[PDB]
Amino acid sequence: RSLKKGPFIDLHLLKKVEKAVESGDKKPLRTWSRRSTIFPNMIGLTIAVHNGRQHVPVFVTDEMVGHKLGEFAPTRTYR
Amino acid sequence: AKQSMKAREVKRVALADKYFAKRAELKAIISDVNASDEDRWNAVLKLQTLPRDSSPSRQRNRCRQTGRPHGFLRKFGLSRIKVREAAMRGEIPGLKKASW
Amino acid sequence: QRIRIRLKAFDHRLIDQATAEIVETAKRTGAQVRGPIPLPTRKERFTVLISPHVNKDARDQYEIRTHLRLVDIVEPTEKTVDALMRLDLAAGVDVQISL
Amino acid sequence: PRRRVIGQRKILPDPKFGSELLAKFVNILMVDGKKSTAESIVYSALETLAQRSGKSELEAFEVALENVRPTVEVKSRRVGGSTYQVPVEVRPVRRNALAMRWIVEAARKRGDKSMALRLANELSDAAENKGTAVKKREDVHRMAEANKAFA
Amino acid sequence: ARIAGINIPDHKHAVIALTSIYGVGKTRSKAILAAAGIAEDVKISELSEGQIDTLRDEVAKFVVEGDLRREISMSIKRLMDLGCYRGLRHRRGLPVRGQRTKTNARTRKGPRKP
Amino acid sequence: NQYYGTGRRKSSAARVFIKPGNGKIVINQRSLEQYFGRETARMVVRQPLELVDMVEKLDLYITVKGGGISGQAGAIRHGITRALMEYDESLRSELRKAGFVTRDARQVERKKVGLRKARRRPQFSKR
Amino acid sequence: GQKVHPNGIRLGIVKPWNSTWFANTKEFADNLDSDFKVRQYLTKELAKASVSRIVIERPAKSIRVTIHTARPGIVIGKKGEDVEKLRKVVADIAGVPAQINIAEVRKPELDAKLVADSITSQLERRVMFRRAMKRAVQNAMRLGAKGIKVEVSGRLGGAEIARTEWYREGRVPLHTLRADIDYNTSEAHTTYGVIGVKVWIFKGEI
RNA sequence: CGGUCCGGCCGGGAACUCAAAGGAGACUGCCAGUGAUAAACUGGAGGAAGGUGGGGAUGACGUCAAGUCAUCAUGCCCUUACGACCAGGGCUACACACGUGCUACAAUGGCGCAUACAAAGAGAAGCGACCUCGCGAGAGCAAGCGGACCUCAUAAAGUGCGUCGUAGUCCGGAUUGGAGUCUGCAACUCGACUCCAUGAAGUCGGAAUCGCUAGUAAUCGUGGAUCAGAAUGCCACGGUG
């Protein structure tokens, strides 16, 4: 629901992703930017998204492109 | 309010005067113009490298005397309580109790 | 050309005194005066809670009345212009000079 | 009104017929301050209830009112620890008010298409001494005859 | 009669009768009747069969029928299998679009149970 | 010559000029039927010159601002009564007894703090 | 019940405003804050000068302050050096050039602000509150006041349970808007907390 | 009264609406009757208004150790932390219970086209017209306006014609899917709005209970504060009544 003038992604996460893909398979990416959009060059990486207390590991697939990172890290515990 | 809250507001006002007065206006102009560089204006990434407190939307209007963040009035720059205190003492020009 | 004067104040007695002073300054100078035309009063209103905590039903309603007067001089002799441009009026009165 | 003796407000006459009865009927039928909406309903109903009989309009409306007008009603009373129902004589103004209110509530409790049709049918039934308005008047008179001992 | 949308629309004003198709609202019904050449206030009766064939030819342009149900089921299933926030809200029958769950979730939660 | 009268109601103010002789009524460059589609509004406007027998004996030129249909009709009635008293001044008793010379001072009551309307108070719960 | 502020209810009826400038929305809050800072500095600096009222008016591009005091020689000082020092910092606070006038309070026993200040000073000197209240009432009444009542509240005499006490002489018609009622308050900061003093002085009607 | 592109628009006029300053006016003042020849009460005249004309502000001594130490001020505890900075999250959870509201269950109505009549307000890091593009939210360009001048800003119920014909419907709009707009560094948790699609419950509500005496209730729109954005709340305004 952001305008159609381009998606948003935090710059530090962008540079982390480029350094991770250019250097081959790496460790999970620890990030707090739940608001960043999942881009096609992140397919294959597992980003550890902060959820408030932990960094939830999220293995990115082609079906996730377009979502925000926080959509795969629930912040509230309910049983 | 605490002293740290007032200091935060002061710092935010200062940062908003420093950066967002010219630099961020320029960047948001580059971001909103449809005629310019629909591919790599690079303005969107540069807008987030600026401090967050430089955004004027992060400022909260507080009473100029107590720092209260609720019940603010832009006409007087005071919260409702201090507005009433100054009004009853005759320190706000022209302001008086209304009836109709 | 012609000069119109817009007077603003919170007290109507004060703005009437200022307008009287202006029309005497002009007429005693020998210019013609159209006015003073009482323009509508802009009364801002404010409703505030009078309680420190809750008690929302307890409120005070205040208001500020802004009084407006319009004074026009059709042929402003240099006498009239430099006479009114150095007039001494009350502190609580705002004067505009449009040419 | 604990002490208040109160006068009377000025009701305007009907624009079409010049009757205060019809004006109060429109007032009773009106909802949400929609007087123009109620006047069209009343006028359509009076027209439809005119050709049927033959005695113009106002006359048909008065004939319908004559059958719904209650002469005596009961007033609840708490004296002997139980429900006392003293039959009191109804005043003419309250008579007309009750008749009109009953006719309106009976017309609104009908299955016809439009309120004009419901009103026309209710008034025709009342002129024929039947319907639910006449039913309510007979109910009230029955309840008064039952408690006649408490006058 | 019957349409390429199997469903059988009632015999009433064409603009409202075409709404019975799953996927055709009022706007799309008006658009179908406009692109076909049929008036909106004419009933489904009084319509020639050549005119109903025309309406079928126009409704064939839209994905409006069990096909649309399939595309909606596919999207909700993708959400649920992805495990995103909306997927979890769909799994538990809770409001998906930010509505409050403290009170007033009766459409998604159904009749209340103690 | 013209006989003038100013009528007012809730928010309306009608300027009524009457002239000797015809059945013409012009409200805001429109006829009475054109201006007032509501029959009560026409009955109210025609009302004062019915006690005084004027069918085609007076020409009315009316302008009216503010208010709604009924407020404007009452303002026109008030102005017509005033112009008629200016015209004859012996019709005073009749228009008094009819109740037309009285200015209806019923204005909308203001909204008050803590109330949903002028008098409508919020729903009260005890337990 | 809670009472209306007797000064604010009479503003424009029989009471003048203490700030008499005009400004639009742009400069209204700035002028209000600058007036507050000026009045605060003046009240802190002239604490021992018996200052009862600070009237602030803003001509076209300046500010002039009128200080109503019962000790004008103290505010002015030898060769006006003190009032000059006051003006030179009022000009800094307000930003615009400043001017200061000194108005004498001829009868300090009839000014509610000065009476309240006297009572709070006595309370802080550990003076019995009843004595101070009655002395204030007597001094005001023998000087021709039509009426006066003073009220003190909160841990009077070091009491553990707070109490409100008020003395009244003459006539104090708080419901008459035509009544010239001089009202002001003050707080005494003692070892047991704050004691609030309120003074009403009636000087006739119209 | 002349002129007119028919628009108070332009000469003009100062009449009227209105603007806003001053004044008049209502006092049981007058008449009659009742009444302790009193206070008063009932009615009448005149009058725009009649009996404190309507509404508001105005809240006595005190009561509830009533509310607020989290507006503020103020008489035990912490201090390399109970202080301070930051990012993310939460205050938005959800088996359930209650209070206050909005929308409905329809025909005194829904929809479509045409058309009439308000008041009160706000506006300069603001209101933003006209024109162009867009189905629309909006976008581009760009006047005027610190404003009885310009903008917000098309009042809506109403009225005329047509249709629907008592059905879970051309009622109702919940919910959900897809596509977008704008603000904002940033709409995932957790924004508002638009378009297409879908079309829950609901057919008048048990015990019980609330508001309101006249321009009131009921109903219909309008504006403002807070505010980058976010009103079904609050505060105000008028229409019908």
Side-chain angles (χ1 to χ4, degrees):
Chain A
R1 276 64 172 118
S2 175
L3 350 127
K4 267 342 256 252
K5 283 106 171 46
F8 180 79
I9 179 174
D10 271 308
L11 163 78
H12 46 265
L13 180 60
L14 180 60
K15 313 226 92 53
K16 245 138 55 182
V17 170
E18 321 168 321
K19 260 188 169 58
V21 310
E22 78 166 299
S23 89
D25 196 342
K26 275 322 189 235
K27 284 48 65 164
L29 264 50
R30 154 187 275 236
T31 197
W32 295 256
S33 52
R34 318 177 87 258
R35 65 189 196 188
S36 269
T37 296
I38 300 170
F39 278 77
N41 71 320
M42 304 157 59
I43 296 167
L45 314 183
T46 134
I47 284 96
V49 190
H50 198 243
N51 80 315
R53 46 171 159 187
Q54 318 139 353
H55 285 102
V56 199
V58 173
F59 179 71
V60 188
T61 60
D62 57 27
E63 205 75 70
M64 292 175 174
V65 177
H67 283 44
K68 300 306 207 78
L69 274 184
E71 308 208 43
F72 307 99
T75 53
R76 255 161 287 204
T77 298
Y78 178 67
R79 297 303 182 180
Chain B
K2 316 197 287 188
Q3 302 293 88
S4 60
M5 311 298 305
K6 311 173 179 175
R8 277 184 219 162
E9 279 298 324
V10 167
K11 174 152 125 56
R12 291 199 180 105
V13 177
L15 278 182
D17 309 348
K18 176 206 272 275
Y19 291 109
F20 260 64
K22 63 144 190 312
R23 207 175 325 277
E25 300 205 23
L26 268 41
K27 281 165 191 183
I29 274 175
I30 304 297
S31 294
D32 67 29
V33 52
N34 40 8
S36 145
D37 222 359
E38 294 133 30
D39 46 79
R40 207 47 278 172
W41 45 41
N42 298 283
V44 168
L45 299 176
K46 223 173 315 282
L47 187 57
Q48 23 180 330
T49 66
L50 299 189
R52 291 202 185 186
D53 287 335
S54 73
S55 190
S57 286
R58 284 179 57 111
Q59 297 177 184
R60 179 87 181 193
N61 276 341
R62 316 185 93 106
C63 180
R64 295 181 85 140
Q65 295 180 24
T66 51
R68 199 184 196 262
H70 275 302
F72 186 78
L73 290 174
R74 290 173 183 189
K75 175 75 169 190
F76 318 106
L78 303 173
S79 98
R80 44 176 192 88
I81 304 170
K82 287 319 183 188
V83 152
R84 188 162 108 99
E85 289 187 29
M88 285 322 185
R89 287 196 307 258
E91 290 165 354
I92 299 182
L95 188 71
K96 56 180 295 186
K97 299 206 62 176
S99 10
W100 69 95
Chain C
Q1 259 289 359
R2 65 126 170 99
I3 307 167
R4 51 180 33 181
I5 308 164
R6 289 176 54 94
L7 302 149
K8 279 200 178 183
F10 294 141
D11 186 18
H12 73 259
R13 278 297 94 229
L14 202 69
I15 208 184
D16 286 316
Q17 255 150 40
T19 328
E21 180 68 89
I22 285 189
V23 306
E24 307 149 36
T25 284
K27 282 302 306 184
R28 201 210 53 251
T29 291
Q32 263 253 300
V33 171
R34 271 286 202 175
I37 302 109
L39 285 157
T41 299
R42 301 274 261 185
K43 34 189 65 178
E44 311 107 288
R45 293 202 213 267
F46 313 97
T47 296
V48 298
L49 292 186
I50 63 175
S51 199
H53 210 221
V54 269
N55 302 318
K56 180 134 161 215
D57 273 353
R59 314 206 206 184
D60 266 0
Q61 311 212 263
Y62 305 115
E63 82 167 328
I64 297 177
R65 303 193 188 189
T66 313
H67 305 260
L68 240 191
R69 303 287 120 90
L70 182 68
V71 196
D72 242 275
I73 54 194
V74 275
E75 59 280 311
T77 305
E78 302 262 67
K79 210 167 186 291
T80 325
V81 177
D82 69 349
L84 56 78
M85 220 83 199
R86 299 135 75 261
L87 244 189
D88 183 18
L89 302 187
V93 177
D94 179 62
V95 186
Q96 285 190 43
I97 303 303
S98 146
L99 202 74
Chain D
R2 195 136 245 175
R3 55 170 145 221
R4 286 199 264 149
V5 198
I6 55 262
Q8 266 307 332
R9 38 182 91 264
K10 182 107 92 213
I11 183 162
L12 290 188
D14 189 72
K16 193 175 179 183
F17 301 101
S19 189
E20 311 294 331
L21 264 184
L22 280 180
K24 181 130 258 164
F25 195 63
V26 174
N27 275 0
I28 288 177
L29 191 125
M30 167 178 50
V31 303
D32 303 326
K34 290 199 165 188
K35 188 96 78 64
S36 35
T37 304
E39 253 154 14
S40 318
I41 292 172
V42 170
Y43 289 152
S44 326
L46 281 196
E47 180 179 1
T48 324
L49 182 87
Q51 32 128 30
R52 306 218 205 152
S53 32
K55 30 160 72 116
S56 184
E57 283 108 318
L58 258 173
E59 299 171 24
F61 178 63
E62 211 275 342
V63 163
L65 287 195
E66 251 305 270
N67 293 333
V68 197
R69 211 130 57 195
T71 33
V72 46
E73 69 169 329
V74 283
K75 273 183 22 193
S76 212
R77 191 153 179 255
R78 198 42 38 80
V79 174
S82 308
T83 162
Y84 263 107
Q85 313 249 71
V86 172
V88 287
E89 184 222 49
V90 183
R91 291 239 53 183
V93 42
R94 176 162 176 76
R95 249 177 264 189
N96 280 324
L98 281 183
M100 290 189 270
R101 185 195 309 151
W102 292 350
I103 290 190
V104 189
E105 49 166 90
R108 298 198 259 222
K109 272 145 49 51
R110 279 187 84 107
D112 309 337
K113 282 306 179 60
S114 64
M115 187 54 190
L117 225 220
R118 295 157 149 178
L119 245 188
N121 299 334
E122 202 49 66
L123 291 171
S124 59
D125 281 332
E128 227 280 324
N129 207 286
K130 53 185 186 184
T132 42
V134 179
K135 177 66 221 140
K136 181 149 185 48
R137 193 215 74 241
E138 303 213 10
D139 282 319
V140 172
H141 280 172
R142 293 182 183 174
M143 203 156 337
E145 279 149 88
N147 300 87
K148 197 161 197 172
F150 296 140
Chain E
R2 204 196 319 185
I3 314 282
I6 42 182
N7 175 276
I8 284 93
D10 251 327
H11 285 62
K12 54 172 72 151
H13 279 190
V15 58
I16 263 62
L18 284 188
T19 307
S20 313
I21 310 178
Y22 182 89
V24 170
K26 184 229 60 170
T27 289
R28 265 182 183 176
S29 152
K30 294 166 66 64
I32 288 289
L33 287 180
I38 296 119
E40 270 139 50
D41 64 308
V42 69
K43 293 181 183 179
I44 298 298
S45 35
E46 303 96 70
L47 255 46
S48 144
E49 182 64 40
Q51 274 184 323
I52 303 180
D53 157 84
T54 297
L55 288 169
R56 298 200 190 104
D57 263 27
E58 315 274 279
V59 76
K61 300 164 185 173
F62 295 131
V63 185
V64 294
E65 248 331 323
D67 283 50
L68 175 63
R69 301 180 194 271
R70 191 150 27 225
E71 313 198 331
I72 299 174
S73 298
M74 262 47 158
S75 61
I76 297 179
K77 181 222 63 216
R78 178 200 340 272
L79 280 177
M80 291 189 302
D81 300 355
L82 209 56
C84 58
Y85 179 83
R86 297 166 60 208
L88 304 176
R89 304 308 284 194
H90 269 286
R91 287 181 193 176
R92 318 221 218 288
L94 284 169
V96 190
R97 304 180 176 190
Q99 301 94 329
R100 67 150 58 205
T101 36
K102 195 168 190 172
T103 67
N104 306 344
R106 283 299 134 211
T107 298
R108 295 285 291 159
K109 299 213 295 180
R112 54 192 80 190
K113 59 274 171 195
Chain F
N1 205 261
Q2 313 251 48
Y3 303 92
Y4 173 79
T6 282
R8 279 195 212 82
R9 209 148 194 295
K10 321 185 179 175
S11 283
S12 326
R15 306 153 69 252
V16 182
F17 302 83
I18 78 166
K19 231 160 53 170
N22 214 346
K24 196 188 80 192
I25 299 178
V26 169
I27 318 176
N28 282 322
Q29 254 43 69
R30 269 119 68 83
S31 153
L32 177 54
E33 334 290 328
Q34 310 182 31
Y35 199 83
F36 287 126
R38 211 194 138 134
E39 202 92 42
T40 49
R42 313 205 204 109
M43 189 263 291
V44 164
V45 165
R46 293 189 185 107
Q47 204 174 2
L49 21 88
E50 296 254 18
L51 292 91
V52 198
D53 316 350
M54 269 87 178
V55 172
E56 320 156 280
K57 286 193 181 175
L58 279 164
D59 259 351
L60 316 184
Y61 181 84
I62 307 145
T63 88
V64 60
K65 298 172 175 180
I69 309 307
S70 275
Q72 288 197 348
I76 294 167
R77 193 184 90 186
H78 198 227
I80 290 172
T81 304
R82 284 197 167 173
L84 249 51
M85 288 181 296
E86 205 81 358
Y87 160 80
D88 201 70
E89 194 59 41
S90 147
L91 313 173
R92 249 218 178 270
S93 45
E94 324 172 332
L95 305 155
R96 254 278 170 209
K97 187 200 166 185
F100 301 152
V101 314
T102 299
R103 207 284 202 188
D104 210 38
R106 316 208 297 271
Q107 313 279 107
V108 174
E109 192 175 336
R110 61 161 281 192
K111 199 219 154 294
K112 292 151 185 44
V113 176
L115 276 36
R116 304 263 308 290
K117 299 216 295 174
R119 301 199 183 197
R120 178 58 165 98
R121 196 177 313 256
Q123 186 154 295
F124 160 78
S125 187
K126 176 207 280 198
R127 282 207 184 209
Chain G
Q2 282 68 245
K3 295 158 189 47
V4 76
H5 201 274
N7 179 85
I9 195 61
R10 293 167 165 84
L11 282 176
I13 299 175
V14 293
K15 241 64 194 171
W17 283 261
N18 286 334
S19 285
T20 85
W21 39 269
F22 180 91
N24 299 288
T25 303
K26 177 196 228 71
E27 280 96 0
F28 206 98
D30 309 333
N31 287 15
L32 230 50
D33 202 9
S34 148
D35 287 359
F36 169 78
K37 295 184 169 183
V38 164
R39 251 182 272 259
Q40 178 184 223
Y41 166 76
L42 279 181
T43 302
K44 178 199 49 52
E45 254 279 347
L46 308 178
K48 306 181 162 193
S50 312
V51 168
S52 71
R53 181 167 177 241
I54 298 165
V55 181
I56 287 179
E57 41 198 29
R58 291 173 181 266
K61 311 164 297 329
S62 65
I63 183 167
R64 66 153 160 265
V65 186
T66 298
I67 307 174
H68 294 74
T69 175
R71 267 278 201 82
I74 290 306
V75 187
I76 296 174
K78 196 269 164 190
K79 272 321 212 313
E81 65 210 333
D82 263 298
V83 69
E84 174 69 19
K85 285 284 171 44
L86 285 186
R87 194 248 295 165
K88 284 216 213 74
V89 285
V90 164
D92 290 10
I93 298 175
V96 297
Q99 172 181 156
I100 295 196
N101 320 321
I102 316 287
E104 180 177 19
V105 170
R106 316 264 309 104
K107 288 170 295 182
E109 293 75 46
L110 294 183
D111 189 322
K113 185 55 182 176
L114 300 184
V115 172
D117 290 1
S118 210
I119 295 183
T120 56
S121 310
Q122 292 175 249
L123 290 187
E124 291 187 34
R125 291 176 238 157
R126 267 87 87 197
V127 173
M128 272 165 327
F129 66 96
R130 293 182 183 174
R131 207 170 195 94
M133 290 171 58
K134 299 213 220 73
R135 290 177 87 83
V137 166
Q138 288 170 186
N139 283 346
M141 284 307 284
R142 77 169 176 80
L143 277 202
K146 294 303 173 185
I148 169 155
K149 68 157 169 176
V150 351
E151 163 178 305
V152 306
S153 318
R155 300 198 70 175
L156 312 172
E160 232 280 329
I161 290 182
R163 183 205 344 166
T164 164
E165 275 246 19
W166 57 278
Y167 201 94
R168 194 267 337 170
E169 207 81 71
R171 192 159 77 88
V172 192
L174 288 182
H175 272 71
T176 304
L177 302 174
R178 205 206 287 104
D180 188 304
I181 308 266
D182 191 14
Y183 165 83
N184 229 289
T185 82
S186 187
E187 310 148 319
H189 293 343
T190 53
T191 43
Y192 301 111
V194 186
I195 305 183
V197 183
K198 298 177 171 169
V199 179
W200 299 258
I201 304 197
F202 179 48
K203 308 174 185 187
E205 269 143 50
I206 222 161

